[PDB]
DNA sequence: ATGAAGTACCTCCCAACTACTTTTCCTCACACTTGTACTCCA
DNA sequence: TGGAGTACAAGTGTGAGGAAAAGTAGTTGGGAGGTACTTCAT
């Protein structure tokens, strides 16, 4: 289950098609994408 | 329309099997009655067929299934289970379809939801049509169980049970082919018959004339005038059972008649259980944050120390025990002023009976005129 | 008995109000020529009068330049039967399109004979029929000094779909008079002024149905009745909870340049602030010139209270409230 | 003098708050909130009786058909005896005639002598205005309005030995102008439908309108409510409709529209308080107590309160209650559709500083609605008030005192005809059940004499064997009439079926007979899961169905027993619908009706989805 | 619902941090017998950070942290379409003091103009400037220069001086 | 009687609020006539 | 006991009156910069 985060009230929030791009608890518009469990790799340098 | 109307009919029967405990044969009886009216829609000229369905008709083919199984439910216990919103009648479209709602036309869904209650005998006339639309006669056994109707109307108003047999001797007088108070069929015209042809209705004016003639021509001086005033005020008295408070809901809905704005004379406790009923009205009935915040400032509960767990054993008593208050009230059992007190009871027994059966004052007044004037035309 | 918060709409009421103001229009223009010699039909009607939008009735001061002589040109019976027959000769031809009870209604109301049936009393909608039941028990138990039961009614009233701003804020004295599990009574008027803050001009041409200005909406040139109730509340609630600078900033941010009651409450904020600090606990550098500002705002906000419209302050006594306050300063 | 006014208007509505404060830092509630504090104020009636005697609309012109006020005739002027209260009401066949002291309750005089003068028109408006308190006297004359004329009477020289009220009259001025007139005031000042006039009252009753007048005719005011009152005795009048209030000085040329109430409200009622400054106005949606200006007595718009009801037939009465520091005003609005009253408490003080307290409401007697409520002045925090009501469509005037601490003819006329031939004819069918119940009080008592008998156990064994052969006759008649695809009696036996009075042992006939059919061709309904429809509770057993009914008619019947036996027997032989066929019958029928409908109704004939 | 926008929201949106400009008119016809007062919405002009009209005005370093700013947020700049811009200060002539400039490009203006001249920069109480140069011609004539719209107008000095007040020629 | 020219004030923008028809419905009354149910005048 | 007018049982033709939910017609609160036009003085 992919989700997002409201930038204002910090509530985790998934979003579907035919939805207003808003938070659903506060009415905030700016709504940043959370990070999920996914493999990236690095040299330890 | 039909795929959803049957589904609202299916959900109304599925309530009665679960909660009012009508048996699992009652589900089958209604399907033939639904299939015989569904075959009726077939036979019409299908272009501008103008099919006749209403929400009054989902009670009828639920009442046509009631007397064929010969159940002691009556139309007083259909006008009550809808007005207290127990089975899906009012707002029958608000929760049921969930997809068919938006792809149905507006006119077909306002009919399909319970916008009004049936009033002034609108419920019987739909039965009289539906008994003519399908042939309920000579395919089913239209014998109305009128004996419990006398028994319930004994228990309605807490009279001695001699009235049960003072009535049934009158019924066995004024009836052609003494038994068989049959449900009336009408398929010929659009005129509602001014006979009061409905056999379930004729029991009332039988019971209204029985309760008068035993008390007016009281030759035995058996029923004293001290008892009459101890019967009227025992009956004209407000109690807080589960069954009378549901009858307070029915007095709310019907606006024309007097004793419809009767809620001013309620008590404290009769209002709390009405508001405790109100938690069964709201369940049938992006800037939603305003109501989300207003319901937070007005929480629906009691704000502290509620009435669920640590309340009592019993405050609210059942239908059997307020009778035992009414019966133990009318202990004295051993004239121009007598008949004035007779009409105290007759008025209070009939105005009680007028809201419980959804008819006008003249709908019952005409039924006195087609019984009393037919009882003496057959006598003399 | 009481007023219901329902937008109730039926063709039979929309017939008899359309039939009435149509007949009103013809006898108006017929009278427009008789006194001279000696397309909704209701949207046209209200273009003549002024809807008050502050009050239910557009009141006037009288001993002023609203004077007018007595029009001693009266009406008599001959002049009235001739000025009504030409409307009714043209009014009878739409009377074949209406329902018979309205043709029964329109004849009787044309000769006096006010109606006796209330418009909410034959609705039989089953949902309005419990709204009429709940509001008549709500105003009854507010009247019957019974606040825990009127709250249960009011919480179950706002949850029915369709209710309006009539019942909403006025008899929200229940939280104000509960005071046990209270939401303070001021969290609700802050809710009312957050979502009903309206600044659209009052258009006055559209027929208003079910929303009415002088107690529940808030347009330009008319502060909302709950807005100035919120300001008188949160100043007494500020005083009784002795925070004064919070309301002294929240009133600062709107310049309502129209009404003066919002300026007097502003003037009264600094007055109560200068009242409280004028004790000084002597029995002293900044506490002298801190009070002298709040004396000065009261003298500049009461002055701009008086340049606006009618809000009669007792300006004489307020100057004596402050002239005693500098004596504590001295 | 508080602060929150508009000048042109001045409010204090339904318990939001006040709109004022002065912030008086004096440790004495530093606020002059327009809503004073005290505890509750309840009103209890003290009921009495004083005396007595298309329909979708109502008439605005008929206002009061009774009156009662302290009056002062010419003899009590000269004499030191002063102060008598009379009652002038209407009566007659169509209500066409015109006609006292309180000992401990208010009642009609001991001599009970009404001076019933009679008129040749229905009586419509009965009122006196009364007089001012700075004139030294009270009025002695009443004015009435009828459909033919306009008459002024005068009470002259009330008596003590005979309680005799002899009157005079003024001459009845008819319709010179042919339009119905509405309201009289004195303080011959009349208001016709549109135009008003001033008259000169004579002092000789043994042998008219003055020559100055005006109108308020608005063409688009379809109601017929007109109204006139002088304002503070300064020859300034206030003329009304349901749309606007006009102030007219007839002494100059001066006329001004003060109120204009077209947009959302309308002016309902207007009663002139005997305080010559403060006068209460009833609009719809608001109660206004609009007083007089200090400088020039024209009209001041003072502290008003939001009226929560909404109706077209509301009136008002107001009564002053003079108290030591202050003056009270209660304001009773009443309606012709119901019985509820609605009040407020205002408190007038010295510097025209006056306030509000709240609201309360009390009921009446349930037959009729108030067409008239009238208070009693009583010659002049334990809030007391008295008044007398008069209900619509009844002509009995009662008496009430509020302190701080039905057989309709419509049900009776349907019966009871005066046929001497058919008098005993109704009693003849009564006489049938005079006997036949005494038969069945002993026909069943015989069965009470046999309790668990071997003669009744033989009879059930005769019963259930008579239920048996008719059963296998009935089912096999259905087996040959099975394939029809186009009914349950258990009353096939006919001898008695009722010579057995043992209700639990009848269940042993009833339970055993059901076990004998384990295979198909018959179905049976229940009697414990289905008998709960009567007692409106959980009824697990049919014996305790009987046992809670037997303990329900203990007091009402002589010995109460065999009735309770054979009601239950009459139920089960009415709830004997036990012969519905089994799984083969309706399922082959429900498929049979599904075929005659096309493919269109097949998918529309489908349960079992959610 | 009316909400309270903070400048961290206006950077994420990449919009301006605008505050609404209101402006009430006076439609006076026939010299004040009839007036009309209309408060007109004139758009939203952008607002300098931590000024009066910012929401970060009277605010603590603890609250600047909670409202998504640095704890020592300095302000003094506008946010215009996401980009933070500021009005550069300038160096102009000191107000209200007649300077005594000589300048070679006054004889490049006309005939017989000297290079001599007095220049004053007069500011109004609403901080609006007005510069008046006072030339010297080689005739002995002295003129008075100003710029009204973008044009440049010259008048003799005794036409001003005898219009300012009632002057005897010896005064 | 034109070749050029600044101003002809056009346009070139949507949405939201709150009202008013608009879409077929379904419900019936509202009441007609000759016989059915009695009493005046031979 | 026979001969005619009105009281009422008993069966039958006309549209009209009444609901709610999609869809719609006016005043408003929400924003972008040149293009296009028909003349008139020399």
Chains touching chain C through at least 3 C-beta pairs below 8 angstroms are B, D, E
One-letter-per-residue 3-state SS of B95-133: CCCCCCCCCCCHHHHHHHCCCCCCCCCHHHHHHHHHHHH
Strand partners, E134: E118, E144
CB atoms within 10 A of CB B122: 15
Domain with residue A11: its CATH number is 2.20.28.30
Quote the minimal CA–CA distance from C69 to chain D in Å: 5
Contact of A29 with chain E, judged by CB distance below 8 Å, is answered with: yes
Structure tokens at D449: 């004499």
DSSP string across D159-179? -SSS---EEEE------SSSS
Q: What are phi and psi of D133, to 5 degrees?
A: -90, -5
State the burial class of residue C23 (Cβ atoms within 10 Å of its Cβ: 0-12, 13-18, 19+): buried
**Sign, CA torsion D556/D559/D563/D568:** positive
Can you tell me which residue has the tokens 């500049």? C300
Contact in structure between D473 and D579 (CB atoms under 8 Å): no
Structure tokens at C71: 């029009």
CA dist., res. D501 & res. D455, Å (int): 12
Structure tokens at D367: 């037959």
CA dist., res. D21 & res. D25, Å (int): 11
From the list D525, D586, D600, which residue is nearest B28 (CB)? Answer: D586
Experimental method: cryo-EM
Sheet holding D343-348, edge to edge: D315-322, D327-334, D343-348, D354-360
Structure tokens at C281: 């606990």
Name every chain C residue with its beta carbon within 8 A of the beta carbon of D360. 143-144
H-helix or E-strand spanning residue E85: strand E83-85
Q: What is the helix, strand, coil percentage profile of chain E, to 5?
A: 15, 30, 55
Quote the minimal CA–CA distance from C115 to chain D in Å: 4
Q: Which of D597, D594, D609, C126 is nearest to B4 (CA)?
A: D609
CB atoms within 10 A of CB D522: 18
> Which segments of D266-314 are extended strands (E)?
267-271, 280-283, 286-288, 305-306
Q: For residue D405, how far is the Cα from the chain centroid? A: 25
Q: Which of residues 17-56 of B touch D (CB under 8 A)?
A: 20-23, 25, 28-29, 31-32, 35-36, 38-39, 41-42
H-helix or E-strand spanning residue C329: helix C325-329
Quote the minimal CA–CA distance from D328 to chain C in Å: 19
Q: Which of D319, D397, D312, D330 is nearest to D65 (CA)?
A: D397
Strand partners, D304: D11
Strand partners, E46: E18
CA dist., res. E171 & res. E167, Å (int): 6
Tell me the HSE value of B163 on the side-chain side, using a 13 A CA sphere: 28
Tell me the HSE value of D125 on the side-chain side, using a 13 A CA sphere: 28
Contact of C160 with chain B, judged by CB distance below 8 Å, is answered with: yes
Checking each nucleotide's C1' against the CA of B113, the nearest proves to be G20
Cited resolution, angstroms: 2.9
Checking each nucleotide's C1' against the CA of B374, the nearest proves to be G9
Burial D451-466 (b: 16+ CB within 10 A, else e): eeeeebbebbeebbeb
Contact in structure between D70 and D85 (CB atoms under 8 Å): yes
Can you tell me which residue has the tokens 């009744």? D456
Structure tokens at D147: 């459909």
CA dist., res. D86 & res. D126, Å (int): 13
| CB-based contact C31 D219, cutoff 8 Å | yes
Contact in structure between E80 and E16 (CB atoms under 8 Å): yes
Q: Which of D513, D516, D518, D522 is nearest to D572 (CA)?
A: D513
| CB-based contact E9 A27, cutoff 8 Å | no
Quote the minimal CA–CA distance from E86 to chain C in Å: 25
Structure tokens at D404: 């701080």
As annotated, the binding site of A for Zn(2+) includes: 6, 9, 23, 26
- Strand G nucleotides where any atom sits below 7 Å of a protein CB: 9, 12-14, 16-22, 26-30
H-helix or E-strand spanning residue D476: helix D454-479
SS3 label, residue D555? coil
| CB-based contact E12 A27, cutoff 8 Å | no
Q: Which of D595, D593, D586 is nearest to D478 (CA)?
A: D586
Strand partners, D332: D317
Residue E124, CA distances (Å) to A27, D455, E95, E129 in order:
47, 128, 10, 6
Name every chain B residue with its beta carbon within 8 A of the beta carbon of D407. 340-344, 346-347
**Closest CA in chain B for residue A19:** B286
Q: For residue A42, how far is the Cα from the chain centroid? A: 25
Long-range contacts of E14-17 (CB under 8 A, 24+ apart): E14/E81, E14/E82, E15/E81, E15/E82, E16/E44, E16/E46, E16/E78, E16/E79, E16/E80, E16/E81, E16/E82, E17/E46, E17/E47, E17/E49, E17/E54, E17/E78, E17/E79
SS3 label, residue B35? helix
Contact of A27 with chain B, judged by CB distance below 8 Å, is answered with: yes
Quote the minimal CA–CA distance from B167 to chain D in Å: 10
Domain of residue A12, residue span:
1-45
Name every chain B residue with its beta carbon within 8 A of the beta carbon of D600. 42
Q: Count the domains in chain A.
A: 1
Size of interface B-E (CB pairs under 8 A): 3
| CB-based contact B32 D412, cutoff 8 Å | no
Contact of D570 with chain C, judged by CB distance below 8 Å, is answered with: no
CA dist., res. B19 & res. D174, Å (int): 75
B and C touch with 3+ CB pairs <8 Å, answer yes
Residue D58, CA distances (Å) to D223, D337, D390 in order:
11, 11, 17
Strand partners, D97: D91, D118
Structure tokens at D495: 């001898």
CA dist., res. D344 & res. D304, Å (int): 11
- Strand F nucleotides where any atom sits below 7 Å of a protein CB: 18-31, 37
CB atoms within 10 A of CB D77: 12
B194 touches strand F (CB under 7 A): yes
Burial B87-98 (b: 16+ CB within 10 A, else e): bbbbbbbeebbe
Report chain D's terminal Cα–Cα distance, integer Å: 71
Any idea what the Cα angle at residue E70 is, between residues E65 and E75, rounded to 5°?
120
C10 touches strand G (CB under 7 A): yes
Residue D534, CA distances (Å) to A23, B356, D461 in order:
54, 16, 30
Can you tell me which residue has the tokens 């258009």? C203
DSSP string across B199-256? HHHHHHHHHHHHHHHHHHS-TT--S-HHHHHHHHHHHS-----HHHHHHHHHHHH--S
CA dist., res. D170 & res. D151, Å (int): 6
Chain breaks in chain D (C to N over 2.5 A) after: 53, 99, 187, 207, 380, 405, 486
From the list C194, C195, C257, which residue is nearest E24 (CB)? Answer: C257
Tell me C2's DSSP state. B
Checking each nucleotide's C1' against the CA of B363, the nearest proves to be F29
Checking each nucleotide's C1' against the CA of C127, the nearest proves to be G20
B50 touches strand F (CB under 7 A): yes
| CB-based contact E1 A27, cutoff 8 Å | yes
B50 touches strand G (CB under 7 A): no
CA dist., res. C188 & res. C168, Å (int): 10
The stretches of E50-169 forming alpha helices (DSSP H) are 61-66, 157-164
Contact in structure between B322 and B239 (CB atoms under 8 Å): yes
- Å separating the CA of residue B210 from the C1' of nucleotide G12: 34
State the burial class of residue D93 (Cβ atoms within 10 Å of its Cβ: 0-12, 13-18, 19+): exposed
Residue B321, CA distances (Å) to B164, B324, B326, B333 in order:
20, 5, 9, 21
CA dist., res. D73 & res. D138, Å (int): 8
Checking each nucleotide's C1' against the CA of B49, the nearest proves to be F25
Can you tell me which residue has the tokens 């009495």? D48
**Closest CA in chain B for residue A23:** B286
Residue B29, CA distances (Å) to B61, B136, C150, D420, D590 in order:
9, 12, 47, 53, 10
Strand partners, D306: D286
Residue C109, CA distances (Å) to C104, C123, D36, D250 in order:
9, 21, 44, 32
CB atoms within 10 A of CB D348: 23
Strand partners, D283: D267
In sequence order, the 6+-apart residues with CB closer than 8 A to the CB of A39 are: none
Domain ranges of chain C: 10-38+76-124, 125-327
The C-alpha torsion from D279 through D280 and D283 to D284, rounded to 10°, is: 180
SS3 label, residue D247? strand
Task: Taking each helix axis as running N to C, give the angle between helix B162-171 and helix D423-440, from 0 to 180 degrees, rounded to the nearest 10.
Answer: 120
């Amino acid at each position: 289950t992919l989700k997002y985060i409201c930038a204002e009230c910090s509530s985790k929030l998934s979003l579907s098609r035919t939805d207003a791009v808003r938070c659903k608890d506060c009415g905030h518009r700016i709504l940043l994408k959370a990070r999920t469990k996914r493999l990236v790799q690095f040299e330890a340098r | 329309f039909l795929k959803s109307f049957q589904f609202i009919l299916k959900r109304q029967i599925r309530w009665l099997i679960t909660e009012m405990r009508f048996p699992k044969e009652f589900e089958h009886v209604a399907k033939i009655i639904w299939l015989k009216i569904l075959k009726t829609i077939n036979d019409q000229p299908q272009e501008e067929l103008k099919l006749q369905l209403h929400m009054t008709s989902t009670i009828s083919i639920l009442y046509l299934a009631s007397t064929h199984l010969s159940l002691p439910v009556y139309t007083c216990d259909y006008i009550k289970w809808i007005c207290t919103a127990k089975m899906p009648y009012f707002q029958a479209s608000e929760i049921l379809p969930k997809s068919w709602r938006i792809q149905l036309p507006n006119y077909y869904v306002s009919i399909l939801e319970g916008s009004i209650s049936p009033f002034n005998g609108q419920l019987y006339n739909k039965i009289a049509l539906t008994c003519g639309m399908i042939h309920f006669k000579e395919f089913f056994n239209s014998e109305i169980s009128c004996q419990g109707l006398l028994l319930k109307l004994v228990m309605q108003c807490a009279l001695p049970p001699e009235f049960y047999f003072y009535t049934k001797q009158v019924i066995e007088f004024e009836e052609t082919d003494i038994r068989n108070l049959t449900l009336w069929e009408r398929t010929d015209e659009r005129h509602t018959g001014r006979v009061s042809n409905h056999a379930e209705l004729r029991v009332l004016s039988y019971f209204m004339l029985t309760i008068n003639w035993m008390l007016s021509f009281d030759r035995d001086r058996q029923y004293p005038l001290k008892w009459i005033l101890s019967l009227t005020e025992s009956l004209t008295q407000r109690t807080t059972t589960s069954e009378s408070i549901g009858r307070n809901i029915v007095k709310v809905v019907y606006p024309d008649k007097p004793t419809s704005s009767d809620y001013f004379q309620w008590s404290e406790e009769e209002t709390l259980e009405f508001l405790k009923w109100m938690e069964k009205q709201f369940l049938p009935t992006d800037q939603k944050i305003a109501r989300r915040k207003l319901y937070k400032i007005f929480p629906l509960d009691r704000e502290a120390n509620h009435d669920g767990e640590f309340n009592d054993s019993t405050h609210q008593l059942t239908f059997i025990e307020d009778l035992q208050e009414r019966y133990a009230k009318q202990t004295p059992f051993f004239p121009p002023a007598r008949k004035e007190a007779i009409g105290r009871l007759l008025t209070h027994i009939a105005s009680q009976l007028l809201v419980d059966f959804a008819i006008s004052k003249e709908q019952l007044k005409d039924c006195i005129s087609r019984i009393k004037n037919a009882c003496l035309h057959r006598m003399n | 008995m009481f007023e219901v918060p329902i937008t109730l709409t039926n063709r039979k009421f929309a017939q008899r109000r359309k039939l009435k103001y149509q007949y009103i229009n013809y006898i108006s223009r017929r009278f427009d020529r008789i006194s001279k010699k000696s397309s909704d039909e209701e949207r046209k009607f209200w273009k003549k009068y002024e809807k008050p939008e502050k009050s239910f009735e557009i009141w006037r001061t009288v001993s002023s330049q609203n004077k007018q002589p007595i029009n001693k040109q009266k009406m008599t019976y001959h002049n009235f039967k001739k000025i009504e027959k030409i409307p009714l000769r043209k009014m009878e031809i739409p009377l074949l399109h209406c329902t018979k009870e309205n043709k029964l209604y329109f004849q009787s109301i044309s000769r006096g004979l006010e109606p006796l049936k209330t418009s909410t009393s034959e609705v039989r909608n089953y949902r309005t029929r419990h709204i009429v039941t709940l509001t008549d028990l709500l105003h009854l138990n507010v009247s019957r000094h019974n606040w825990s039961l009127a709250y249960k009614i009011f919480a179950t009233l706002i949850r029915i779909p369709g209710v309006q701003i009539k019942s909403l804020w006025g008899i929200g004295v229940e939280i104000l008079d509960n005071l046990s599990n209270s939401s303070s009574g001021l969290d609700f008027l802050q809710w009312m002024c957050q979502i009903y803050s309206s600044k659209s001009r009052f258009v006055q041409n559209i027929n208003y149905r079910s929303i009415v200005p002088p107690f529940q909406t808030g347009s330009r040139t008319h502060t909302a009745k709950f807005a100035i109730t919120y300001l008188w509340s949160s100043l007494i609630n500020c005083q009784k909870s002795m925070l004064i600078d919070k309301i002294s900033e929240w009133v600062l941010t709107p310049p309502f340049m129209e009404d003066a009651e919002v300026w007097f409450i502003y003037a009264s904020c600094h007055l109560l602030k200068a009242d409280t600090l004028s004790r000084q606990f002597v029995n002293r550098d900044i506490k002298i010139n801190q009070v002298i500002k709040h004396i000065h705002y009261v003298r500049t906000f009461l002055k701009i209270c008086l340049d606006k419209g009618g809000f009669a302050v007792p300006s004489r006594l307020i100057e004596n409230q402050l002239k005693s306050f500098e004596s504590r300063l001295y | 003098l508080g602060v929150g006014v508009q000048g042109a208007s001045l409010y204090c509505p339904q318990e939001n708050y006040t709109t004022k404060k002065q912030e008086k830092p004096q440790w004495l509630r530093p606020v002059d909130d327009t809503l004073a504090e005290d505890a509750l104020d309840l009103h209890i009636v003290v009921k009495s009786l004083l005396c007595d005697t298309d329909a979708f609309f109502w008439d605005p012109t008929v206002a009061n058909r009774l009156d009662s006020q302290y009056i002062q005739t010419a003899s009590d002027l000269r004499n030191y005896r002063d102060g008598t209260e009379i009652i002038a009401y209407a009566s007659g066949k169509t209500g066409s005639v015109l006609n006292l002291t309180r000992q401990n309750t208010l009642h009609l005089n001991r001599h009970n002598n009404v001076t019933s003068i009679e008129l040749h028109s229905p009586i419509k408006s009965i009122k006196i205005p009364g007089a001012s308190e700075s004139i030294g006297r009270r009025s002695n004359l009443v004015g009435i309005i009828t459909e033919n004329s306009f008459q002024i009477f005068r009470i002259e020289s009330v008596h003590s030995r005979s309680c005799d009220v002899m009157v005079s009259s003024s001459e009845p001025l008819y319709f010179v102008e042919i339009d119905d007139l509405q309201v009289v005031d004195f303080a011959a000042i009349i208001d016709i439908k549109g135009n008003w006039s001033i008259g000169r009252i004579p002092k000789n009753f043994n042998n008219l309108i003055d020559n100055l007048h005006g109108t308020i005719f608005d063409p688009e005011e379809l109601s017929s409510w007109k109204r006139i009152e002088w304002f503070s005795h300064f020859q300034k009048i206030l003329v009304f409709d349901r749309s606007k209030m006009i102030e007219i000085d007839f002494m100059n040329n001066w006329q001004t529209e003060v109120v204009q109430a077209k947009a959302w409200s309308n002016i309902r009622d207007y009663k002139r308080i005997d305080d010559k400054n403060g006068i209460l106005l009833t609009s719809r949606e608001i109660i206004i107590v609009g007083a007089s200006e200090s400088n020039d007595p024209v009209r001041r718009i003072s502290w008003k309160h939001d009226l929560d009801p909404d109706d077209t037939t509301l009136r008002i009465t107001v009564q002053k209650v003079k108290k030591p520091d202050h003056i009270l005003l209660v304001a009773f609005v009443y309606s012709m559709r119901h019985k509820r009253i609605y009040m407020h408490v205002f408190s007038h003080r010295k510097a025209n500083l006056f306030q509000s307290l709240g609201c309360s409401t009390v009921l009446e007697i349930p037959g009729g609605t108030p067409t008239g409520i009238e208070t009693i002045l009583t010659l002049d925090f334990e809030l007391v008030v008295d008044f007398l009501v008069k209900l619509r469509n009844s002509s009995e005037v009662y008496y009430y005192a509020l302190s701080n601490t039905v057989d309709h003819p419509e049900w009776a006329s349907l019966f009871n005809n005066a046929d001497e031939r058919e008098k005993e004819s109704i009693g003849a069918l009564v006489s049938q059940i005079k006997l036949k119940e005494r038969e069945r009080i002993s026909r069943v008592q015989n069965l009470i004499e046999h309790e668990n008998s071997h003669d009744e156990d033989k009879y059930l064994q005769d019963l259930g064997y008579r239920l048996s052969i008719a059963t296998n006759e009935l089912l096999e008649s259905w087996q040959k009439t099975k394939d029809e695809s186009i009914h349950s009696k258990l009353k096939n036996l006919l001898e008695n079926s009722d010579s057995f009075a043992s209700i639990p042992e009848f269940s042993s006939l009833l339970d055993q007979f059901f076990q004998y059919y384990q295979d198909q061709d018959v179905t049976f309904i229940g009697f414990e899961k289905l008998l709960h429809l009567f007692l409106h509770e959980d009824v697990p057993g049919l014996d305790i169905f009987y046992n809670k009914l037997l303990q329900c008619w203990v007091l009402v019947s002589p010995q109460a027993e065999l009735l309770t036996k054979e009601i239950v027997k009459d139920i089960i032989w009415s709830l004997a619908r036990l012969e519905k066929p089994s799984l083969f019958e309706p399922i082959q029928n429900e498929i049979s009706r599904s075929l005659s409908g096309p493919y269109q109704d097949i998918i529309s004939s489908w349960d079992m989805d959610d | 619902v009316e909400r309270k926008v903070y400048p961290s929201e206006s950077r994420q949106r990449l919009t301006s941090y605008r505050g609404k400009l209101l402006l009430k008119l006076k439609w006076s016809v026939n010299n004040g017998e009839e007036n009309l007062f209309e408060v007109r919405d004139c758009g939203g002009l952008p607002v300098m950070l931590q000024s009066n009209r910012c929401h970060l005005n009277k605010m603590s370093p603890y609250e600047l942290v909670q409202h998504k700013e640095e704890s020592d947020e300095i302000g003094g700049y506008f946010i215009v379409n996401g980009i933070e811009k500021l009005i550069r200060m300038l160096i102009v002539q000191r107000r209200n003091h007649p300077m005594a400039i000589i300048r070679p490009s006054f004889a490049n203006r006309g005939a017989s103009y000297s290079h001599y001249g007095i220049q004053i920069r007069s500011v109004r109480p609403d901080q609006t400037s007005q510069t008046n140069v006072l030339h010297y011609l080689n005739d002995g004539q002295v003129t008075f220069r100003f710029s009204w719209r973008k044009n440049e107008y010259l008048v003799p000095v005794v036409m001003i001086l005898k219009a300012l007040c009632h002057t005897s020629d010896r005064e």
